[PDB]
Amino acid sequence: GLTEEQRMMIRELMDAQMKTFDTTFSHFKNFRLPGAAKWSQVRKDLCKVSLQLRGEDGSVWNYKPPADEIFSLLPHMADMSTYMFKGIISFAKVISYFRDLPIEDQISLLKGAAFELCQLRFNTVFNAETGTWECGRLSYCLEDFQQLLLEPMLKFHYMLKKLQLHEEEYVLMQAISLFSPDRPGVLQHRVVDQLQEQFAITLKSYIECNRPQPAHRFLFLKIMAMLTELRSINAQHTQRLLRIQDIHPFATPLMQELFGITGS
Numbered sequence: 436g437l438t439e440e441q442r443m444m445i446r447e448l449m450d451a452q453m454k455t456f457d458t459t460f461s462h463f464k465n466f467r468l469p470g471a472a473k474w475s476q477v478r479k480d481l482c483k484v485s486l487q488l489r490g491e492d493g494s495v496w497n498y499k500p501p502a503d504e505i506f507s508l509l510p511h512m513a514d515m516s517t518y519m520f521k522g523i524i525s526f527a528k529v530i531s532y533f534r535d536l537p538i539e540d541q542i543s544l545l546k547g548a549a550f551e552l553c554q555l556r557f558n559t560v561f562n563a564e565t566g567t568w569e570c571g572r573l574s575y576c577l578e579d580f581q582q583l584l585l586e587p588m589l590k591f592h593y594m595l596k597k598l599q600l601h602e603e604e605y606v607l608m609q610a611i612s613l614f615s616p617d618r619p620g621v622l623q624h625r626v627v628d629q630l631q632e633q634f635a636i637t638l639k640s641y642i643e644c645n646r647p648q649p650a651h652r653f654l655f656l657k658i659m660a661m662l663t664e665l666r667s668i669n670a671q672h673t674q675r676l677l678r679i680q681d682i683h684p685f686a687t688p689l690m691q692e693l694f695g696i697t698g699s
């Protein structure tokens with residue numbers, strides 16, 4: 436029961452996702468690997484995942500992290516974040532509604548939503564039965580707990596996975612997050628707001644036309660609630676990373692650009 440405009444809208448988003456989301460991570464290469472009240476808070480900020488690399492020959496490398504030193508993981512994390520940020524940026528540039536915005540609003544929207552779209556893409560490779568993010572030959576496993584789900588990002592991934600979303604519903608979440616009219620520095624707030632409203636209406640219509648089961652009652656509102664939580668997680672995590680960056684630099688040039696770090 437979608438209109439022609441709504442079907443075309445989903446087609447372009449799915450087209451952009453297919454072109455820019457390397458679900459096997461085959462082109463993620465050459466990445467680095469692990470070899471006073473601020474440092475206190477940064478110690479609280481720092482804290483748990485094992486890393487597995489499966490070679491093409493069949494060999495396997497595993498890394499288990501240390502206690503307390505806590506910075507051995509940041510270069511790899513920066514490289515993964517940078518790789519995912521590049522895919523998110525390519526995703527936005529293909530979308531016609533995005534590249535018709537002025538370049539200053541494109542930058543403002545990408546600065547505000549890059550993290551959120553990365554986590555949404557990571558949820559599609561999350562395995563809730565094994566607690567692992569399967570990124571091709573890379574795997575990030577949660578180490579051995581109802582106390583673990585207290586962590587808001589982990590709780591997000593478990594709750595979003597439980598909703599059993601389609602590929603089309605994920606890319607519409609990505610569009611709704613991307614076209615947030617209230618990111619800092621957005622000028623065409625009225626245009627972005629009307630674009631966001633139409634992406635949300637398309638999602639609402641898609642769910643009503645394709646999910647009649649009682650388990651999917653209120654699904655649209657559950658998804659919208661997840662996006663609000665993801666934005667709150669985004670804000671807390673950005674302040675976490677900026678405190679760590681202040682104590683121990685790690686941000687790549689691309690992450691610096693997205694964080695507004697000038698280099699002086």
Ligand SMILES: CC1=CC[C@@]2(C)CC[C@@](O)(C(C)C)[C@@H]2[C@@H](OC(=O)c2ccc(O)cc2)C1
Nearest residue numbers: 512513515516557568575586587588589672
């Ligand atoms: C750059 C990273 C690489 C490994 C991944 C992508 C594996 C999955 C991950 O998103 C997961 C710890 C949520 C993690 C990333 O974790 C986060 O981005 C994160 C973790 C906890 C939070 O409270 C917020 C963000 C870290």
